[PDB]
Design a protein around this ligand. Structure first.
Ligand SMILES: Nc1nc2c(ncn2[C@@H]2O[C@H](COP(=O)(O)OP(=O)(O)OP(=O)(O)O)[C@@H](O)[C@H]2O)c(=O)[nH]1
Ligand SMILES: Nc1nc2c(ncn2[C@@H]2O[C@H](COP(=O)(O)OP(=O)(O)O)[C@@H](O)[C@H]2O)c(=O)[nH]1
Ligand SMILES: [Ca+2]
Ligand SMILES: [Mg+2]
Lengths: 428, 439, 54, 331
């Protein structure tokens, strides 16, 4: 089978990563001990894309837990599924990285990295058909931001021809109050432009706006955010984990979503949105699922889709429903909003249907948009960066790790380019 | 008796393969284990149906075919389904990584890596062949393997078997079932490279099969099974003449003599009827007149296009069931007046007709009802260029922006093979215009 | 309006009806072309590893 | 909602159509290259019929009939009448015509009937002599046609001038033949003078060449209520009986002749299209046809109505929303 090696690094990285695992582990019927207890053989039929076979009919996540501080390791090991991970697959330091990209990438992350790469080799070396890696991390901190993008550079150098996939959580001052996050984010985006094939942009602005407004969560928590990040992750990976036609491996996805190498930043979207513990009373009708998933209130990146144009788009439907109707409804979308799709990529919307629904939903949809409107997100970060880089403010925290102003100027220029690049393709 | 090798390539060709090879088995009365009580030539015989099957001293009849996907998921269903006993492990070739809907990947990267094993595996079949006449190649245009390996294989075949015929059954891309947006890229690329190595191409447009399944068989959202079963009927009409006693279309050279005056215009349009729902409460049987007329309605063709705006260079009527020339000529006579059917001057206005008395065989529990008679027409009309014009337009919209080009280039393909492939297509569309579309 | 070459057998009949009369490369060059592609494909990866080693 | 693109920015006529459609909030205009349209107001030349009727979810309509050019190109029309058994030489409302080429050729066959009063026509060259005429086109470098110039035209009075009848015919997707009730005579301002075959002024009623010289009618357009009156006051007849009966007969005969070759009844896209037929009344009140016009413009007076009628019968018939100005020619 085509195997995927999952790496999760830093606080954010390690917590959405654990959540992802417990969600798909349920989906696939694996219990918090690694043993299959489902019905449908559709659960097991592709189980080895994300799990590993051990004697006992036991299934080990092909996951590697990385952090520069022991905190998060111990939390996940003492989480619900804390016990189903290869325990040598926990790589962790002591110092921490103190919300500093330069410490994750350059100084602290250096010591620890080779120990991470050993487990990545040991995992990769026992793959019949490694298709690539998927890393979970945040971009506003120091370990996942700084060490994550270092590992990505080191992984591409040993595996230059396997696919590199990241779920990257973007910082928002609605949820955080560390002043240097715009620095860490720009340094990380600069890396992601050059070294990943597909990046999902989980924006904490969008995650907060959904939770606070839409779901009316008066005092939201990362567990609430991560609830949206959990469902999305399950959504966009359905096509890798069950049998199907479309976007069923990381390469085939990329060839369908990425019309130019740098424009590989994806805008996710889920319907229905749900507060956890939300008693589900009614199913969404297929036209409801369709309308919502394309709606801006439903994106995981705080960008106005009507402010740009869709380059490519993938729609995943789950639960028992009518392909005749999904197909009818997906057509109507493109037909009533046809200017919002570039006319110079014909038929740029591919739609999959999985019969197996997610947990607690009878009906869901997951949207993956490659829209030029995501320039809005990089622009948001870029303006915060500029505001304080133009006065070289807070730069000492970085130059004292051996970084140099020139690097900040580069990362900023590559991102400003990424934005102008997305804009040129908005005009055809 | 002269054998033909079938080569099924990529997911589409391989799934269409079992669709045919299953039907073939039902028609010749062969069982899922190669047994054919009806053959009394136990271990051989040069009967007409040996062209497609060879015989095993134990009495198994084994298709003269080889399947080959660059990934194992599909062919594994052939080495496990009902007809697993029927094929031979060495004729089901598989690789590990597929071609990610990337022509350049399947032609160059991975292509090279498994061409020789395929060519070898193929020569194996050419040896137990007293007078091999050529090959039928089943593939899709849009996928990685289907487009990029096939064109690779088509060039080794023109090298390894120069005096041999090659026919194509080729699946033209439609978005209602297409799983890639680069499909026009792969289609133009593989058409170009393959154009000089194929003696005759039958393009089934998925869009056409799909509406035929929707309108005529009441099937809400056709699956590949429905599509592939219908394609096996049409394919079986095109090949019936090579496996049954007849005088028309007896060997593959005859196909290009009958359908293909010019070598580049070698894409005959296939049109089939009647297509009825097995579940239809009652159907008043259609007549020779009624089925033959149906052959001029665009809604039965394997390619939606208007042959009234275009000229003909050949026509063949392949009837299966209860037909006699009196009715056939009678019907020709009468549609000749009602319809617009102009041939090109340097060609006679005329029809070649063939009748197999045994009505069409239907897969039990399939979607198609048994019918007392059926016809497949094989017109070569310039009107099929419509399909090239629209595919070439999609190519142009994307290549103007260079969308996706880097995926092919990154595999080694040079940007120019895009423009030289497309420019050849413009030549193709130009010839179709010269020939037809004058008066 | 003219039936030609009527041929009959127990399987069926065959005939022509006219209504109006008329008014390559080499295994060498193949290999020369596949290899030019891995040379480009391997050069690209070289430059990429080269960057990454910087 | 419905969507249309526009691809002939020179259509006085379908500029009105798009203006009306938009002015309903029920029609948006996409960009010409956006394929996701219901209606294509379609270009005049090399319109890409091959590409129509393939978008799922969309019903598509185009405002031309592929192959209607046979009716609408002078050399083709001729061959159409001459060959089609429905028309043939039995045809008695088409001036005697042949196709000629500079430097299937009917040049010999033309003189064949040229014998002994004989005036013909080819701006363009009118002359009663084969020479100067045949060689005019024989140099011209564009295939043209030789048609018997009608020597005894019905001439209006006061004036003694010739006119020209334009009827607008709309053919929808069902192949209903609508005839717009209001037509126009393209009258001549200079009294029609025999022996002036090279005058090209009184002899030619082309709205252009008449605006060069021109009086009685606003821009040389006489409409039907006036022409009916004159036909009654003199002649003692109706426009209906004397002329329009022949006209309805010629429109029906021409359009149905080709119906099997351009009907879109069972086709993956639908066509409608507006034709302008050009007629000649003669001394004995016998109607003659000359041009069928594939992309006709409309008399300025009548744009408001015809263009709304196109939207009504031809476009809204297919894409609905939420007395009749036409005369359906029954067949
Ligand atoms: N009509 C029909 N089309 C099919 C069928 N299977 C696949 N296709 C089409 O074939 C296209 C790809 O063809 P291939 O090149 O053979 O793809 P493949 O067989 O999976 O091989 P790879 O591309 O290398 O993965 C798809 O886009 C489908 O639209 C089928 O069973 N019936
Ligand atoms: N959305 C989301 N963001 C998180 C989560 N945990 C941490 N973050 C973000 O990550 C930032 C802190 O980064 P940090 O964990 O110190 O980076 P590290 O030291 O390299 O691991 C904060 O600003 C948070 O906004 C989480 O569970 N969900
Ligand atoms: Ca026998
Ligand atoms: Mg494939």
């Amino acid at each position: 089978m085509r195997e995927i090696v999952h790496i999760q690094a830093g606080q954010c990285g390690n917590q959405i990563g654990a959540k992802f695992w417990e969600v798909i582990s349920d989906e696939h019927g694996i219990d918090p001990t690694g043993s299959y207890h489902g019905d449908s053989d559709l659960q097991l039929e592709r189980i080895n894309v994300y799990y590993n076979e051990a004697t006992g009919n036991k299934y080990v996540p092909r996951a590697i837990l990385v952090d520069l501080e022991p905190g998060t390791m111990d939390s996940v090991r003492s989480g619900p599924f804390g016990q189903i991970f290869r325990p040598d697959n926990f790589v962790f330091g002591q110092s921490g990285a103190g919300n500093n990209w330069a410490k994750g990438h350059y100084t602290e992350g250096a010591e620890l990295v080779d120990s991470v790469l050993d487990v990545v080799r040991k995992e990769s070396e026992s793959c019949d058909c490694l298709q690539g890696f998927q890393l979970t991390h945040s971009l506003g901190g120091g370990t996942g931001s700084g060490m994550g993008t270092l590992l990505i550079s080191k992984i591409r150098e040993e595996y230059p021809d396997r696919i590199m996939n990241t779920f990257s959580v973007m910082p928002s001052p609605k949820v955080s109050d560390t002043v240097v996050e715009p620095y860490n984010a720009t340094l990380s985006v600069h890396q992601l432009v050059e070294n990943t094939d597909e990046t999902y942009c989980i924006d904490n602005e969008a995650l907060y706006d959904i939770c606070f407004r839409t779901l009316k969560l008066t005092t939201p928590t990362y567990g609430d955010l991560n609830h949206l990040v959990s469902a999305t992750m399950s959504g966009v990976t359905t096509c890798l984990r069950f049998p199907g036609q479309l976007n069923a491996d990381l390469r085939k996805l990329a060839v369908n979503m990425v019309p130019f190498p740098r424009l590989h930043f994806f805008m996710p979207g889920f319907a229905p949105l749900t507060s956890r513990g939300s008693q589900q009373y009614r199913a969404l009708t297929v036209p409801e699922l369709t309308q919502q998933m394309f709606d801006s209130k439903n994106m995981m990146a705080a960008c106005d889709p009507r402010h740009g144009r869709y380059l490519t788009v993938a729609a995943i439907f789950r639960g028992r429903m009518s392909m005749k109707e999904v197909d009818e409804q997906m057509l109507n979308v493109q037909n009533k909003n046809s200017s919002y799709f570039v006319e110079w990529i014909p038929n740029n919307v591919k739609t999959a249907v999985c019969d197996i629904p997610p947990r607690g939903l009878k009906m869901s949809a997951t949207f993956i948009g490659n829209s030029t409107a995501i320039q809005e997100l990089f622009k948001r970060i870029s303006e915060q960066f500029t505001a304080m880089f133009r006065r070289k403010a807070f730069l000492h925290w970085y130059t004292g790790e051996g970084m140099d102003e020139m690097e900040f100027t580069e990362a900023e220029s590559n991102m400003n380019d990424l934005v102008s690049e997305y804009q040129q393709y908005q005009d055809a | 008796m002269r054998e033909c090798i079938s080569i099924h390539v990529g997911q589409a060709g391989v799934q269409i393969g079992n669709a045919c090879w299953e039907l073939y088995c039902l028609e010749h009365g062969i069982q899922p284990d190669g047994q054919m009580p009806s053959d009394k030539t136990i271990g051989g015989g040069d009967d007409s149906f040996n062209t497609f099957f060879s015989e095993t001293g134990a009495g198994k009849h084994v298709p003269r075919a080889v399947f080959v996907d660059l990934e194992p998921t599909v062919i594994d269903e052939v080495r496990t389904g009902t007809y697993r006993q029927l094929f031979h492990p060495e004729q089901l070739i598989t690789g590990k990584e597929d071609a990610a809907n990337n022509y350049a990947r399947g032609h160059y990267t991975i292509g090279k890596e498994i061409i020789d094993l395929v060519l070898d595996r193929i020569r194996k079949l050419a040896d137990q062949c007293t007078g091999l006449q050529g090959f039928l190649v089943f593939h899709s245009f849009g996928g990685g393997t289907g487009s990029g390996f096939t064109s690779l294989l088509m060039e080794r075949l023109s090298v390894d078997y120069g005096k041999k015929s090659k026919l194509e059954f080729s699946i033209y891309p439609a978005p209602q079932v297409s799983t890639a947006v680069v499909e026009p890229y792969n289609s133009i690329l593989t058409t170009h490279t393959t154009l000089e190595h194929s003696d005759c191409a039958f393009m089934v447009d998925n869009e056409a099969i799909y509406d035929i399944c929707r309108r005529n068989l009441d099937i809400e959202r056709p699956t590949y099974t429905n599509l592939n079963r219908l394609i096996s009927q049409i394919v079986s009409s095109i090949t019936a003449s090579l496996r049954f006693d007849g005088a028309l279309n007896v060997d593959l050279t005859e196909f290009q003599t009958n359908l293909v005056p010019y070598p580049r215009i070698h894409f005959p349009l296939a049109t089939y009827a009647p297509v009825i729902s097995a579940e239809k409460a009652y159907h008043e049987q259609l007549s020779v007149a009624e089925i033959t007329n149906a052959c001029f309605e665009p809604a039965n063709q394997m390619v939606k296009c208007d042959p009234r705006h275009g000229k003909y260079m050949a026509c063949c009527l392949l009837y299966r069931g209860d037909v006699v020339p009196k009715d056939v000529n009678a019907a020709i006579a009468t549609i000749k007046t009602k319809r617009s059917i102009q041939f090109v001057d340097w060609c006679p206005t005329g029809f070649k007709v063939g009748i197999n008395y045994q009505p069409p065989t239907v897969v039990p529990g399939g979607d198609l009802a048994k019918v007392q008679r059926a016809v497949c027409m094989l017109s070569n009309t310039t009107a099929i260029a419509e399909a090239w014009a629209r595919l070439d337009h999609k190519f142009d919209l994307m290549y103007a922006k260079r969308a996706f080009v880097h995926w092919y280039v990154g595999e080694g393909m040079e940007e120019g093979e895009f423009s030289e492939a497309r420019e050849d297509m413009a030549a193709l569309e130009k010839d179709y215009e010269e020939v037809g579309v004058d008066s | 309006m003219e039936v030609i070459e009527l041929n009959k057998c127990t399987s069926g009949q065959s005939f022509e009806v006219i209504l109006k009369p008329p008014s390559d490369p080499s295994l060498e060059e193949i290999q020369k072309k596949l290899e030019a592609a891995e040379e480009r494909r391997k050069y690209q990866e070289a430059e990429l590893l080269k960057h990454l080693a910087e | 909602m419905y969507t249309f693109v526009v691809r002939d920015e020179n259509s006085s006529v379908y500029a009105e159509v798009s203006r009306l459609l938009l002015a309903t909030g029920q029609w948006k205009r996409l960009r010409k290259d956006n394929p996701r349209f219901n209606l294509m107001l379609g270009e005049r030349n090399r319109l890409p019929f091959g590409r129509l009727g393939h978008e799922p979810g969309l019903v598509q309509l185009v405002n031309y009939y592929r192959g209607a050019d046979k009716l609408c190109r002078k050399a083709s029309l001729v061959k159409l009448i001459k060959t089609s058994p429905e028309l043939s030489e039995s045809c008695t409302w088409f001036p005697e015509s042949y196709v000629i080429y500079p430097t299937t050729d009917e040049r010999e066959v033309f003189l064949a009937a040229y014998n002994r009063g004989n005036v013909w026509i080819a701006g363009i060259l009118i002359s009663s002599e084969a020479s100067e005429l045949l060689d005019f086109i024989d140099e011209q470098g564009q295939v043209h046609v030789i048609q018997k110039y009608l020597e005894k035209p019905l001439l209006l009075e006061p004036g003694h001038r010739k006119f020209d009848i334009r009827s607008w015919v709309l053919v929808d997707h069902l192949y209903n033949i609508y005839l717009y009730r209001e037509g126009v005579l393209r009258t001549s301002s200079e009294p029609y003078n025999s022996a002036n075959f090279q005058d090209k002024t009184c002899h030619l009623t082309n709205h252009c060449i008449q605006k060069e010289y021109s009086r009685y009618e606003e821009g040389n357009e006489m409409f039907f209520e006036e022409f009916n009156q004159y036909l009654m006051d003199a002649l003692n007849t109706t426009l209906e009986n004397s002329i329009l009966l022949q006209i309805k007969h010629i429109i029906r005969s021409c359009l149905m002749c080709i119906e099997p070759a351009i009907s879109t009844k069972h086709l993956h896209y639908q066509s409608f299209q507006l034709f302008g037929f050009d007629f000649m009344v003669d001394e004995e009140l016998k109607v003659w046809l000359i041009e069928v016009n594939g992309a006709p413009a409309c008399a300025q007076k009548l744009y408001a109505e015809l263009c709304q009628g196109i939207v009504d019968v031809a476009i809204s018939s297919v894409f609905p929303l939420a007395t009749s100005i036409f005369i359906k020619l029954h067949h």
